Structures are given as C-alpha cells and as structure tokens.
Ligand binder design. Structure first.
Ligand SMILES: Nc1ncnc2c1nc(Sc1cc3c(cc1I)OCO3)n2C[C@@H]1CCCN(Cc2cccc(S(=O)(=O)F)c2)C1
Ligand SMILES: [K+]
Ligand code: NA
Length: 208
C-alpha cells in the first residue's frame, strides 16, 4: 500500500529551484549526503552511550557509496540512526520550512547553492543530479520504509519489503541521463577527497 503526500509549498519551491537554476557545481550533492550520513552516525553513537542496546540492530558505523551503471543509480548507505515514518511524512517537512526560507532568502542576497547545508536542507541538493530519489530507512523505533520523489510536488511512502537493513538509511539517486559521471570511480574518489576527507567514519567506495 503506497501513500502519496504533497510537499509543503516551500519545499516544492526549493526543489523546483534546485532543478531549474543553472548551476554547474553539481558535485556538492555528494558532500551534503555524506555529511547527513555522518550526522546520523553521530546521533546513534551518542544515543548508544546512554542505551547500549540501541546498537543491537548493528554495531558497525560506516558509509558505503555504491554506483550501479546498469540501473544508473548512485546509492549512499549509512548505518546511522535512521528515520521514522513520522519523520518522513511530517517532521522533516515541518522543521525544514524555516531553513528553506532562510536559504532562498540568502540566495536572493547573493549566496550560492553550495551553502545549502548551512540551512539544514542539503538533502535536496540530490536533485542537482537525480531525476528521482528513493530513500530506504530503518530506525530502531519503527519499521523499514521507502520514501520516493521525482519532485513535481509529491512524494510517496510505503513499507519496504526489500532486503532488511537492520538500521540506517540508503539514499538511492536515480541519475539524470547527463549526470552519469557520478558513477565513475575516479570521479567519486575525486569528490570525496575534495569535500569529505575528514569525515570520522569509514567511507567505502564500491566498484563495479
Ligand atoms: N542519512 C540520514 N539519516 C538520518 N536522518 C537523515 C538522513 N538524511 C537526512 S536529510 C533528509 C532526508 C530525507 C528527507 C528530508 C531531509 I532535510 O526526505 C526524505 O529523506 N535526515 C533527516 C535530517 C536529520 C537531521 C535533522 N533534520 C531535521 C532538522 C532538525 C532541526 C533543525 C532543522 S533546520 O532548522 O536546520 F531545517 C532540521 C532532518
Ligand atoms: K546504486
Ligand atoms: Na553547526
């Protein structure tokens, strides 16, 4: 059973801006998603200090980058804290409205799209390179869900029947036809070295 939701108008506007603005420095999407993974790994690690059973769903704290040229997908996998259904349907859009407003204001004031992460909404930079984004996520307090959006003002949420993850988040980028450079080992290595060299978790770039 698939549920379809409308984005808040401000988030739909942000997604249209990211899709429509001419901006060549698209590679920053990967820094933003890796940063989000690192933050989610920090969260589960710190929570585990007070409740060690929170790692019963998996002790390993890592980030995997998985290109697939057959499917034309780049997947950013982490074993961080994950997201609840309530996050996916309500909490994320509610909290992000203020960051989105501040970001779009900053852009009019001359700021650059690369500053998007300072406003808490760097996830949406995925749409610089992806025509569709699928997020598979598992939080200790909830079931495994699949969120998906091709923009256009709506997203879907369903329970995920795929391979159980234990805990964490997979961001699956269905790349635009002209953005397949982000499936190349040499290109991903270059971007991780440039923007993500000090992330405090192992980043494994899978190869094909
Ligand atoms: N790998 C990851 N693992 C776990 N959780 C993650 C995450 N990746 C993201 S980002 C993501 C993923 C989405 C999505 C929207 C967004 I955004 O829809 C579909 O998938 N999250 C959510 C973040 C976590 C940090 C808090 N944050 C909300 C917030 C709190 C306080 C202030 C502000 S704010 O005032 O600064 F706007 C924002 C949402
Ligand atoms: K992939
Ligand atoms: Na900060």
């Amino acid at each position: 059973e698939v549920e379809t939701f409308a984005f808040q108008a401000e988030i739909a506007q942000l997604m249209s801006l990211i899709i429509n603005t001419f901006y060549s420095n698209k590679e920053i999407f990967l820094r933003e998603l890796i940063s989000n993974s690192s933050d989610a790994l920090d969260r589960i690690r710190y929570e585990s200090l007070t409740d060690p059973s929170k790692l019963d769903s998996g002790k390993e704290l890592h980030i995997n980058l998985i290109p697939n040229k057959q499917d034309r997908t780049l997947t950013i996998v982490d074993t961080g804290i994950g997201m609840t259904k309530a996050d996916l349907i309500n909490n994320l859009g509610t909290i992000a409205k203020s960051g989105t407003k501040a970001f779009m204001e900053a852009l009019q004031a001359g700021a650059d799209i690369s500053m998007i992460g300072q406003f808490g909404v760097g996830f949406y930079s995925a749409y610089l390179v992806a025509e569709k984004v699928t997020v598979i996520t598992k939080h200790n307090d909830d079931e495994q869900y699949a969120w998906e959006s091709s923009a256009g003002g709506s997203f879907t949420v369903r329970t995920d029947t795929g391979e159980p993850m234990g805990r964490g988040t997979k961001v699956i980028l269905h790349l635009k036809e002209d953005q397949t450079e982000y499936l190349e080992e040499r290109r991903i290595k270059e971007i991780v070295k440039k923007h993500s060299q000090f992330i405090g978790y192992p980043i494994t770039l899978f190869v094909e």
